[PDB]
Design a protein around this motif. Structure first.
Motif, mmCIF file in Angstrom:
data_model
loop_
_atom_site.group_PDB
_atom_site.id
_atom_site.type_symbol
_atom_site.label_atom_id
_atom_site.label_comp_id
_atom_site.label_asym_id
_atom_site.label_seq_id
_atom_site.Cartn_x
_atom_site.Cartn_y
_atom_site.Cartn_z
ATOM 1 N N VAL A 225 -7.518 -3.783 8.126
ATOM 2 C CA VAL A 225 -8.175 -3.868 6.834
ATOM 3 C C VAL A 225 -9.318 -4.864 6.880
ATOM 4 C CG1 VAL A 225 -7.784 -4.565 4.480
ATOM 5 C CG2 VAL A 225 -6.179 -3.125 5.564
ATOM 6 N N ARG B 103 -3.794 -6.716 8.155
ATOM 7 C CA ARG B 103 -3.425 -5.469 8.790
ATOM 8 C C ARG B 103 -2.412 -4.733 7.940
ATOM 9 N NH1 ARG B 103 -3.873 -3.091 13.648
ATOM 10 N NH2 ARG B 103 -2.228 -1.601 14.106
ATOM 11 N N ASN C 203 -7.398 4.182 17.232
ATOM 12 C CA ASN C 203 -6.534 4.735 16.207
ATOM 13 C C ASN C 203 -6.049 3.688 15.213
ATOM 14 O OD1 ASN C 203 -6.388 7.555 16.945
ATOM 15 N ND2 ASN C 203 -5.307 6.870 18.783
ATOM 16 N N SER C 204 -6.093 2.415 15.578
ATOM 17 C CA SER C 204 -5.646 1.331 14.719
ATOM 18 C C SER C 204 -6.706 0.863 13.734
ATOM 19 C CB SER C 204 -5.201 0.161 15.581
ATOM 20 O OG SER C 204 -6.261 -0.331 16.373
ATOM 21 N N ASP C 205 -7.873 1.500 13.729
ATOM 22 C CA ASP C 205 -9.001 0.993 12.968
ATOM 23 C C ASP C 205 -8.701 0.965 11.483
ATOM 24 O OD1 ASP C 205 -10.833 0.414 15.021
ATOM 25 O OD2 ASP C 205 -11.475 2.503 15.140
ATOM 26 N N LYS C 206 -8.076 2.020 10.970
ATOM 27 C CA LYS C 206 -7.909 2.141 9.534
ATOM 28 C C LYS C 206 -6.677 1.409 9.044
ATOM 29 C CE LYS C 206 -5.528 6.593 9.237
ATOM 30 N NZ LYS C 206 -5.689 8.016 8.758
ATOM 31 N N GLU D 234 0.838 -1.188 0.000
ATOM 32 C CA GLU D 234 0.000 0.000 0.000
ATOM 33 C C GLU D 234 0.873 1.238 0.000
ATOM 34 O OE1 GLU D 234 -3.341 0.321 -0.193
ATOM 35 O OE2 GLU D 234 -3.555 -1.851 -0.422
#
Ligand SMILES: [K+]
Ligand SMILES: [K+]
Ligand SMILES: [Mg+2]
Ligand SMILES: [Mg+2]
Ligand SMILES: [Mg+2]
Ligand SMILES: [Mg+2]
Ligand SMILES: [Mg+2]
Ligand SMILES: [Mg+2]
Ligand SMILES: [Mg+2]
Ligand SMILES: [Mg+2]
Ligand SMILES: [Mg+2]
Ligand SMILES: [Mg+2]
Ligand SMILES: [Mg+2]
Ligand SMILES: [Mg+2]
Ligand SMILES: [Mg+2]
Ligand SMILES: [Mg+2]
Ligand SMILES: [Mg+2]
Ligand SMILES: [Mg+2]
Ligand SMILES: [Mg+2]
Ligand SMILES: [Mg+2]
Ligand SMILES: [Mg+2]
Ligand SMILES: [Mg+2]
Ligand SMILES: [Mg+2]
Ligand SMILES: [Mg+2]
Ligand SMILES: [Mg+2]
Ligand SMILES: [Mg+2]
Ligand SMILES: [Mg+2]
Ligand SMILES: [Mg+2]
Ligand SMILES: [Mg+2]
Ligand SMILES: [Mg+2]
Ligand SMILES: [Mg+2]
Ligand SMILES: [Mg+2]
Ligand SMILES: [Mg+2]
Ligand SMILES: [Mg+2]
Ligand SMILES: [Mg+2]
Lengths: 42, 90, 273
Positions: free
Chosen positions: C270, C181, C264-267, C167
């Motif tokens: 994946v 992730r 904060n780790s949500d995005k 990415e």
RNA sequence: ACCCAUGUCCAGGAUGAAGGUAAGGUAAUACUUACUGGAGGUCCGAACCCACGCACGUUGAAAAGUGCGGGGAUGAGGUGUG
RNA sequence: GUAUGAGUAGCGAAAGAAGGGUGAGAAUCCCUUCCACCGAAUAUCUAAGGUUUCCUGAGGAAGGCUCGUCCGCUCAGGGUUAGUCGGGACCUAAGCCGAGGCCGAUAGGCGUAGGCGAUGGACAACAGGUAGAGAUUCCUGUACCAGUGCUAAUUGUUUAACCGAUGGGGUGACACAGAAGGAUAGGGAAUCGCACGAAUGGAAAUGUGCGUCCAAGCAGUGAGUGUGAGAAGUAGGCAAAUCCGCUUCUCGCGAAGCAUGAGCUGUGAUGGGGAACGGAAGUUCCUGAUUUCACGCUGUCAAGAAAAGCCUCUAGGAAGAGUAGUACUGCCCGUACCGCAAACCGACACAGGUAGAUGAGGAGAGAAUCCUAAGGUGAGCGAGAGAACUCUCGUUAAGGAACUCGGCAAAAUGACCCCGUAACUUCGGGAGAAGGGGUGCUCUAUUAGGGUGCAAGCCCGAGAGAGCCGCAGUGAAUAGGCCCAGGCGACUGUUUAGCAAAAACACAGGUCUCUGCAAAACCGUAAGGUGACGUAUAGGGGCUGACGCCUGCCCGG
């Protein structure tokens, strides 16, 4: 057996002068015993 | 301060029995040391001191009716002198 | 491999263990030992915060390089060793420098092999590279969330992640839980799974052996009193007389998701497991 | 009560797991017999710990014990110091 | 304050007797002799605790469950001696405090450096004497550790004899179990010496009793156990290294050398101790440790403190250095006494509890059990009648569970060897199943055979016969009652200290569920922590509860 199992070290390090004077609420105990006038503080 | 370190002799039957071996039982300040006692005795009597022994005694509890208290805390030195020296007398 | 014990008495009636073939020495590296002291779930305060812990066999901490900061230097694998402090085993590594370190043993790592770290290291079990420089599909372990911090994510026994793509600044990683992730690309990882793949298959076989492992009894709530548990009480065996099963602090136990809803780790996440 | 670190205690006997060696046996394995080995919240059983039953005590020798029996006794063991 | 009960219950587990003595007074104090009790303790040490209770001399008001001439009581005098023991001036663990700092209505909470803190690590002295009270302390001898000065030699001066970290590294530094050995404590035989040599039938010796030694240190040795050696070069060990670590070559191993190393031999000892003030004998042999070698070896999994101190390394400092012999020096606290107990914890001079080292003999597997040794005790009310009832015990005709909630309790079984041993079984067990037999002594017997030893000698003792005696031969004590069927819980374990031990809890195992790591969950206001020095084969919670065969339908609420 029974509930008093003596030890000088334990006695002093729990109930002794330096343990009282280490703590804000143990200096009140001494203030309160001097206020009654006890021959023995701890 | 030799005259302040060495307070008193200890006159008793044990002590007198022991004097013949050139040993002297003194009562001394509770803060003194063996070595202080050595040099103090050497000063004050001009003997030579070979060895100095020392014990500490607690105070004994006494009574006079209604009134208890411990006798004074004692420190008892037992000086001994070189054989080729002059004696302390008593 | 696994060793069944014959049922010479009912403590062994279904006990199994490991035979410990992978392990060559039983004398660890004194210079890398540190002490550990059992805390038994106690705290800063002395209070039992985490239950069901206390009173096992004592241990020494074996200092284990998860970072792999030693780039380009070759390390000969000297031995594979038991570590009580982890399910996996640990491989001792004598670098040509003279330095000695431990690492997680990967599956297939053998004594005698040589180990590298950095961008010039071939994709081979034991070698550690940045995910920047690792091809897709490969199986890895000891992933780190942050560069230079140390490998942090897949470390246990028989445990493996798999790369899925890129990415740009990030890299997609299927962790062992099924969770895909996003992890940065300057973050290192090792190639390979883990050596102790048999670990899960062991029947402890005895109450005492969990004690030796450091694990106190679990008392159920349906036995407790109402003061002590919300499942407590009832004048016999009583079912879970509530809408849901419950922990000892309310807070439903079954199904209820305990992950923070604004994290904060949500995005970077994946695909949830 | 639970735990932490550090120490220490458990007379004597019994059974005989894995493994290993050898003979037999095989094309080779199996497999059998012996020997060795020394495992176990293993057995028996004192100390130690516990407390199942009964009796006595019940203004007790004792504010929870005594006597006769009883369970565990290398372990989820007992105990000491802090 | 004094009665009542009432001169009543009780006088707190246990063997005393007599003679002498003291004394105003004696069951009770002192002495003697017999007797009895404990003896893996009712002995000997020693922690903790208590704090003078220790010793001596007086005493008998109160205390002592009686008494008292006595005491752990009262008075008065005395008594505790350390360079080496133990703790400090040495080290650190859990934990505690905590400059600054981070948090926080205050107060304060957390916590780094740093420092305290043993139950652990390091550390140099042994044996005798001690007649009122201490003893590795004092005294006698012989030593050891650290240092100092004085002598006598030797060496060194700035390409530096020597010291050497506040830093680096090695060791220190380690679990549990098992087995075999070596040695030694110990125990015991003859031997040697000393005394006796005998009451009642017998014995001048196959007679009896008693004893048959000695350290530390120094020198030497050594059952043995571990361990491969040199040379080069170094991406590393906050800088440095001649050290560690790594690598490469050469020589390779029941062979040395280097570390440790129990013990042994000689000194120490022309000393001490010791049975008749003096001073005899002190050999040989068997057994044999739970001690030591020594966590040394082997194995296992549950994977088994730190720091100092030691050794080395440089960084450094360096004009004084170390060698021998000398003489001197070596601080503080504790040291009495009790210490399975009348001195500690229990309100008591309380049938309770109290850590560890030692802990002998016969028979014995044994620290069991019976009797005993050394040694300690005769238990702080007694004597005398021997009655009902109560208690603890012992035996009982015939029957034998008819008792009773119920075989409660009691009785019976009991040890070693041998034969033999079921259903079932998770193939390990059941199983000591069950059910039965034999056990003594004497001769064959210094035994067949073993162990030990240079041999003499000394221990273990296999069957068998041939006999003997008793009601009975593990003749005592100590030492399983067994079987069938069934429910429950698989199991070992835990539990309502002080009415419930269980079918309750836990358990291994199963399952669901959550959790991506500054995880979730938890404690806390927060910091900070546990979790975890972990990382989905991990962690938290809920439920179920070994194993086998299985676990069905319903998502409307
Ligand atoms: K200590
Ligand atoms: K015995
Ligand atoms: Mg002293
Ligand atoms: Mg849990
Ligand atoms: Mg309940
Ligand atoms: Mg509630
Ligand atoms: Mg409920
Ligand atoms: Mg119901
Ligand atoms: Mg209902
Ligand atoms: Mg057992
Ligand atoms: Mg049993
Ligand atoms: Mg009993
Ligand atoms: Mg038993
Ligand atoms: Mg005890
Ligand atoms: Mg305690
Ligand atoms: Mg009456
Ligand atoms: Mg009466
Ligand atoms: Mg006994
Ligand atoms: Mg006295
Ligand atoms: Mg009286
Ligand atoms: Mg300290
Ligand atoms: Mg004495
Ligand atoms: Mg004494
Ligand atoms: Mg009495
Ligand atoms: Mg009858
Ligand atoms: Mg009859
Ligand atoms: Mg009936
Ligand atoms: Mg009837
Ligand atoms: Mg019965
Ligand atoms: Mg059960
Ligand atoms: Mg109860
Ligand atoms: Mg009960
Ligand atoms: Mg479970
Ligand atoms: Mg936090
Ligand atoms: Mg249940």
């Amino acid at each position: 057996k029974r509930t008093y199992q003596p030890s000088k070290r334990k006695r002093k390090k729990v109930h002794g002068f330096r343990t009282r004077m280490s703590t804000k609420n143990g200096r009140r105990v001494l203030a309160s015993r001097r206020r009654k006038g006890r021959k023995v503080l701890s | 301060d030799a005259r302040d370190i060495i307070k008193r002799p200890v006159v008793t039957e044990e002590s007198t029995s022991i004097l013949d071996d050139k040993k002297y039982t003194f009562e001394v300040d509770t803060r003194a040391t063996k070595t202080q006692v050595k040099y103090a005795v050497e000063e004050i009597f001009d003997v030579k001191v070979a060895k100095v022994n020392v014990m500490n005694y607690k105070g004994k509890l006494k009574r006079m009716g209604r009134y208890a208290g411990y006798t004074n805390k004692r420190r008892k030195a037992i000086v001994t002198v070189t054989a080729d020296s002059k004696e302390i007398q008593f | 491999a696994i060793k069944k014990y014959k049922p010479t008495t009912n403590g062994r009636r279904h006990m199994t263990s490991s035979d410990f073939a992978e392990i060559t020495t039983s004398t660890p590296e004194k210079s890398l030992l540190r002490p550990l002291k059992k805390k038994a779930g106690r705290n800063n305060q002395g209070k039992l915060t985490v239950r069901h812990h206390g009173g096992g066999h004592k241990r020494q901490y074996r200092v284990i390089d998860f970072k792999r900061n030693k780039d380009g230097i070759p390390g000969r694998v000297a031995t594979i060793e038991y570590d009580p402090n982890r399910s996996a085993n640990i491989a001792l590594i004598n670098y040509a420098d003279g330095e000695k370190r431990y690492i997680i043993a990967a599956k297939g790592l053998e004594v005698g092999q040589t180990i590298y770290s950095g961008a010039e290291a071939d994709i081979k079990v034991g070698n550690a590279l940045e995910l920047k420089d690792i091809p897709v599909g490969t199986v890895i372990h000891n992933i780190e969330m942050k560069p230079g911090k140390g490998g942090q994510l897949v470390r246990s026994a028989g445990t493996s992640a798999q790369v899925l793509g890129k990415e740009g600044k990030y890299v997609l990683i299927r962790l062992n839980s099924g969770e895909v992730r996003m992890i940065l690309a300057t973050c290192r990882a090792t190639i390979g799974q883990v050596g102790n793949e048999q670990h899960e298959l062991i029947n402890i076989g005895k109450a005492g052996r969990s004690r030796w492992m450091g694990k106190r009894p679990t008392v159920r709530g349906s036995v407790m009193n109402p003061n002590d548990h919300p499942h407590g009480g009832g004048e016999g065996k009583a079912p879970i007389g509530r809408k849901s099963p419950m922990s000892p602090w309310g807070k439903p136990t079954l199904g209820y998701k305990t992950r923070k809803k604004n994290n904060n780790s949500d995005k970077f996440i994946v695909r949830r497991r």
